[PDB]
Design a protein around this ligand. Structure first.
Ligand SMILES: OC[C@H]1O[C@@](CO)(O[C@H]2O[C@H](CO)[C@@H](O)[C@H](O)[C@H]2O)[C@@H](O)[C@@H]1O
Ligand SMILES: [Mg+2]
Lengths: 235, 233
């Protein structure tokens, strides 16, 4: 668990299914000949972190002091680099980066970096809060992208899909989400960002039925963390 | 950290550890994220190969296990579970050094076998079989364990390490005929006694004529029971 081992901490639990999905992806995306070749990881999946959207939109209790606590726990355990598999939680990214000893890597930049340069007009599937606070907007503008978001009726259904997956019914979530993906495509999306970490779990298996490339924010962050680990002269 | 947090001392291998987290989500009833089990996970895979140590004279995993155990405790884990069957060779030693509660995969798994199944197949690593980890516990319960013959066990071992290398399709081609052989030999149930096995079998249970007992899922259920036994949870 050495710091000199370049251990990656996952500040997770938002939600727990997305965190488990990230772990599976670290295994998938890392080239390894055996157990011992995989990436060293310490994971916090401690879900009591208050709901991010309720905080931002309703003035519910802030997740910030939980994130800070669990970040220091990971650092104290030896994590040299920290990744957060929750898009909405990146509202607090800069604040956490101010207090962090460990390197931090943003899901937002990793995700935008994984969009083909030819897709200028890009759908965005995310929580109401990620949209309302514009987490992707400045970075997308800088890259010369136009973000396409579901209109109000559609967005409510996307939000319901996310929370339905969070409650554990994937089938019901899919029936809610898939029609919203087609609407984005019908409106001209050249790719669609899955900008909430439950979305890839809902979509999994249907990519073939979907006419445009889906950009997986969780997988993008995993790839970035892998590059970070692999950059070291001793790894 | 959180009250009654469960540490997972994982990474053996990492795919099985990920499978364990998925199962904690599946098997816990929760109204929302905030009702899920608090977990801190070590998946730090540099732990030396368990079977290689035991049958091949390779370096011992023990000191790694002890280190990461303390790490989890220091992070606030009050109960520790290990999603590797072969690593239970060291369970008693770890429990001695542990302040936190520990829950054995072996007992959790045997306790989930239907009482009607007397003659049970066992899919596990060579080391788990050779050191008899399941053996004494099973006999106490009146079970008779059936294991593959030499040739078949080499293929089970190959399947496990093939999954560990990341090819599930090749692992399945290797494993499935060994499952059929156990049933042909009269297995009333089969213990998947290696945490990679459920990953290989997943998607095939219907094709399989007898119940498979998932060691990972058994351990998860036992940890959930431990967590829910707290009056302040
Ligand atoms: O847009 C760049 C901006 O993003 C931040 C985090 O908000 O860092 C991200 O981008 C960097 C350069 O691409 C990466 O090295 C880094 O890992 C990623 O988090 C800021 O640091 C930076 O100003
Ligand atoms: Mg390197």
């Amino acid at each position: 668990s050495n710091a000199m081992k370049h251990t990656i901490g996952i500040l997770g639990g938002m939600g727990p299914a997305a965190t488990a999905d990230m772990l599976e992806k670290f295994v998938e995306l890392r080239h390894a000949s055996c157990d011992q070749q995989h990436i060293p990881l310490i994971v916090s999946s401690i879900p009591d972190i208050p709901d991010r959207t309720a905080c931002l939109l309703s003035g519910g209790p802030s997740p910030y002091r939980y994130l800070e606590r669990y970040l220091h726990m990971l650092e104290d355990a030896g994590a040299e680099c920290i990744v957060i598999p929750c898009n909405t939680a990146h509202y607090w990214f800069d604040d956490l980066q101010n207090v962090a000893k460990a390197r931090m890597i943003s899901i937002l930049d990793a995700t935008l970096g994984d969009i083909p340069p030819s897709a200028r007009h890009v759908g965005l599937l995310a929580t109401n809060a990620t949209l309302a606070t514009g987490l992707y907007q400045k970075k997308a503008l800088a890259r010369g992208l136009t973000l396409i978001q579901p209109e109000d009726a559609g967005q409510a259904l996307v939000m319901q899909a996310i929370y339905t997956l969070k409650r554990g019914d994937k089938t019901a979530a899919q029936a809610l989400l898939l029609p919203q993906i087609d609407s984005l495509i019908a409106r001209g999306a050249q790719a669609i960002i899955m900008g909430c970490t439950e979305i890839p779990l809902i979509v999994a298996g249907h990519e073939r039925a979907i006419a445009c490339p889906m950009i997986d924010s969780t997988a993008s962050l995993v790839r970035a963390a892998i590059r970070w680990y692999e950059s070291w002269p001793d790894t």
